[model samples]
Target: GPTGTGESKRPLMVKVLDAVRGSPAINVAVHVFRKAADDTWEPFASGKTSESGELHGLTTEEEFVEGIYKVEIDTKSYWKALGISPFHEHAEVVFTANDSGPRRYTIAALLSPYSYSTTAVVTNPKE
Candidate 1:
């Protein structure tokens, strides 16, 4: 996880997997944003997926806000890197955050060159 204060705060985790082979999608670009009242996105955090296709610290302890949030992945870039023709340009997961929500949340995506699907879950922080 990225550097931050040791506080009991929630953070978002994102994982990218290959849809066809059901394997990790390594080195994909992932970005997190907060949707403002004016319908504009404010960048929160950005990072590339790990070898296991997971991003552990999409947000720091103090970055969580009660509102609509987005996690976007650069599918086109990933596919292009692998020499596969682009299918989908990108994939996005939109979710809501609340003060009383779980201490941790995960946004997992299964993706191919042509399509993508995502799921969200609430999780407890590991001790």
Candidate 2:
């Protein structure tokens, strides 16, 4: 993993998988975005998929204010890395915060170059 310069903060873990029927993919990038109350999106962070089809990254709870946000998965690059043609270029996981205080938000994705799916859970902060 590459070290980042910013102060250390627990990352919001996102798990994404290649749901292709017979083929599995590697080297995929998942980008996280926070949608502000004013109907805008801010890029918070990003991570790439690991060997077992997982992309773990972190975001501070403070950034996920009470509003809507999204996680965009760029499958085009991911497919290219695996020597596959572009199919589903993008996948998004969107949700609403709608509350105060810290929260543990988990966004999970099931995806392929042609199709995808995701789910998110916003719970009270841990620790």
Candidate 3:
């Protein structure tokens, strides 16, 4: 897959960590998504991994609506950053939002140069 950052604006997450097994030095991008009423996906947010291979929170809290969402990572770019060949092109993390509950969610993700995993935890929502 093509590598490099996109000029398009995207949401920023608080943090993202690549705590995958066997690889902890590579960086990855985390893209957030929300499911629409039609069962389709729409862009909600995006964040890049830190030097320690993690991203904190989304760009904006207002974009986090209630529904199923996902986080995508640019594995290709990540691998290139590590100066190695990766087994995957991308990684997507899916999550659900509880509109009735808190708006704040910590979407944590683990990734390797080859694979990725994630989890979402509901926290105090924006009041």
**What would the per-residue lDDT of candidate 2 be over residues 1-127, giving only the tens digit for each residue?**
2343232343444433456733332445665555455545455556675543445434444553534444455555555666778654443334556367655554444556655555333345556
- Give the alpha carbon lDDT tens digit for every residue of 1-127 in model 1: 3354332433334444576656666676664544455555555556676655555555554565555554444455556667878655533334565677554554445556775566344354664
Q: Identify the leading candidate in terms of lDDT.
A: 1
Give the winner by TM-score: 1
Candidate 3 residue-wise lDDT at 43: 52
Where does candidate 2 clash, by residue pair? Answer: 11-58, 12-58, 12-59, 88-113
2 against 3, candidate with superior lDDT: 2
What's model 2's TM-score? 0.47
Candidate 2 residue 8 C-alpha distance from true site, Å? 5.3
Q: Give the lDDT ranking, best first.
A: 1, 2, 3
Q: Model 3, poorest ten-residue lDDT window?
A: 1-10
Model 1 earns a TM-score of 0.52
**Residue 10 lDDT in candidate 1:** 34
User: In candidate 2, which residue ranges exceed 4 Å CA deviation?
Assistant: 1-9, 12-17, 21-25, 30-47, 52-73, 91-94, 106-108, 119-125
TM-score of each: 0.52, 0.47, 0.41
Give the Å error, residue 1, model 3.
37
